[PDB]
Design an enzyme around this catalytic site. Structure first.
Site, short mmCIF file in Angstrom:
data_model
loop_
_atom_site.label_atom_id
_atom_site.label_comp_id
_atom_site.label_asym_id
_atom_site.label_seq_id
_atom_site.Cartn_x
_atom_site.Cartn_y
_atom_site.Cartn_z
N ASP A 232 43.06 35.94 51.30
CA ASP A 232 42.07 34.90 51.55
C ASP A 232 40.87 35.42 52.36
O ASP A 232 41.04 36.19 53.32
CB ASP A 232 42.73 33.74 52.32
CG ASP A 232 41.79 32.58 52.58
OD1 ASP A 232 41.34 31.94 51.60
OD2 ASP A 232 41.52 32.28 53.76
N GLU A 262 39.85 37.48 47.67
CA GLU A 262 38.81 36.48 47.42
C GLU A 262 37.58 36.84 48.25
O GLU A 262 37.52 36.55 49.44
CB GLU A 262 39.30 35.07 47.77
CG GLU A 262 38.23 33.96 47.72
CD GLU A 262 38.01 33.17 49.06
OE1 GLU A 262 38.76 33.35 50.05
OE2 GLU A 262 37.07 32.35 49.10
#
Ligand SMILES: [Ca+2]
Ligand SMILES: [Ca+2]
Ligand SMILES: [Ca+2]
Ligand code: NA
Length: 484
Positions: A232, A262
């Site tokens: 993340d 990400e």
């Protein structure tokens, strides 16, 4: 042997019913049959929002829905036993599991501490606005876990900053002072330095943090059996530590541990920089490709389809590209909403699933459909036409050498020659505008092709030299296949 296909097995508005892990276990068999070989599952540990947390408000990463903390034992998605059982069932059905790893921050602290800080500017975090003593939510002890697995306690100096002073009741970014305290580097230089995002920001230069995240990572691998990671918020996390961490775990475990980060930005050059600065140790989601699909889908046919791949990882560095159409940050009602128009999604999915470039990801809401409400707005995300068939077409027929024809502003296509285990020939053709046709070389002589999507009903034959003219309807895609 088989083409790899992953699914993001959640979206933002899954109900808070503690059932997702059970649904993974119950559907693993069907998903494998379709052609899925890996699932990205949402963060499986307890968040600051309790069972309402999608998972990014991470509180205790050692609590997989096992301990009574933040208002419940389970997470949003189920209990620890249900998680482990879902992973085990995935493995029995030849599906790997990528676990979502949230390292940027921690939220939901057990206590607050007085911290000496510098207020910094929201839009340029290198501009200092004055010193302030604050009460910061930065003590994490996890009392409900009672030191099972780990006795580590987070305190103020493990963090670089927060955005809330509980004493003065002020929302602002407060950078922590102290010997060696600074925003981490390298991170995105947006906003001067984009280390700070939300909650209590981890100090990736602190030795105890660097070691604790490695300790947790080995524990998590051995506890759960996950096969890799989705990282993340990597544009907010010291790039060199992200490489340090995955390098360490691959070395310590000997496992491959496929990892995708990400880095959500639509300038591919920021993603290239990240991959360079992390030595290629992880793939990234092809965020720029999503925006190409979005633009094309909103253009009423006027988008130049020759450029649908331009400025993407799928084109520039495809072996580090996890391709996608849509995700939980772009779906309706989210801050970064940019939902690809429904009519275009069969084309976008045919593009990422049947091209040779990249590692495609299917969105849960696109695969199943999703209905939800928030802020009084009701959303109906309709299942994408042909999505299961396209995944099957990737599983069984999209193999071998590729010949690309991204050569017209409406009608584009490509062919796939097949390989030894998959000796079928395929020609994909699509148009964002009026229909048409294209001569394409498949390399299969005097062979019969039919449209496996059933949209065009005629037969197409190659000539003795492997060339044929394939047709397509307007705003549509056809997948011509000549089986062995
Ligand atoms: Ca720091
Ligand atoms: Ca950060
Ligand atoms: Ca066009
Ligand atoms: Na930091």
């Amino acid at each position: 042997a088989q083409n790899g296909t992953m699914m993001q097995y959640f979206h933002w508005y899954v109900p808070n019913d503690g059932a997702l892990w059970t649904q993974v276990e119950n559907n693993a068999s069907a998903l494998s049959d379709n052609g899925f070989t890996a699932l990205w599952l949402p963060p499986a540990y307890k968040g600051a929002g309790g069972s309402n947390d999608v998972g990014y408000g991470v509180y205790d990463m050692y609590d997989l829905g096992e301990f009574d903390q933040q208002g419940s034992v389970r997470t949003k998605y189920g209990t620890k036993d249900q998680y482990l059982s879902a992973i085990n069932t995935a493995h029995k059905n030849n599906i790997q599991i990528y676990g979502d790893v949230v390292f940027n921050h921690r939220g939901g602290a057990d206590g607050k501490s007085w911290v000496d800080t510098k207020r910094v500017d929201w839009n340029n975090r290198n501009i200092e606005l004055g010193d302030k003593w604050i009460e910061a939510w930065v003590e994490f002890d996890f009392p409900g876990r009672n030191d099972k697995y780990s006795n580590f306690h987070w305190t103020w100096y493990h963090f670089d900053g927060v955005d809330w002073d509980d004493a003065g009741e002020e929302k602002a970014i407060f950078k922590f002072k102290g010997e060696g305290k600074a925003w981490d580097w390298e991170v995105s230089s947006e906003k001067g330095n984009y280390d700070y995002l939300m909650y209590a920001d981890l100090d990736m230069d602190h030795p105890e943090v660097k070691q604790e995240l490695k300790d947790w990572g080995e524990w998590y691998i051995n506890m759960t059996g996950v096969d890799g990671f989705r990282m993340d918020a990597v544009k907010h996390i010291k790039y060199q530590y992200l490489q340090e961490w995955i390098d360490h775990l691959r070395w310590k475990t000997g496992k491959e541990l496929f990892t995708v980060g990400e880095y959500w930005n639509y300038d591919v050059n920021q993603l290239h920089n990240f991959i360079t600065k992390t030595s290629g140790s992880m793939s990234l989601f092809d965020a720029p490709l999503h925006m190409n699909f979005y633009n094309a889908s909103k253009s009423g046919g006027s988008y130049d389809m020759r450029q649908i791949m331009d400025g993407t990882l799928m084109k520039d560095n495809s072996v580090k590209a996890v391709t996608l159409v849509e995700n939980h940050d772009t779906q309706p009602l989210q801050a970064l909403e940019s939902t690809v128009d429904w009519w275009f999604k069969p084309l976008a999915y045919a593009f990422i699933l049947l091209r040779e470039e990249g590692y495609p990801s299917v969105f849960y809401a696109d695969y199943y459909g999703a209905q939800y409400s928030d802020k009084g707005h009701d959303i109906n995300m309709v299942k994408v036409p042909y999505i299961e068939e396209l995944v099957t077409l990737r599983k069984d027929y999209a193999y071998g050498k590729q010949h690309s024809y991204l050569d017209h502003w409406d009608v584009i296509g490509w062919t796939r020659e097949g390989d030894a285990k998959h000796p079928h020939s395929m020609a994909v053709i699509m148009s964002d505008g009026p229909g048409g046709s294209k001569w394409m070389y498949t390399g299969k002589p005097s062979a019969r092709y039919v449209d496996k999507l059933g949209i065009r009903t005629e037969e197409v034959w190659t000539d003795a030299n492997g060339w044929a003219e394939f047709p397509v309807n307007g705003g549509s895609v056809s997948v011509w296949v000549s089986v062995e």
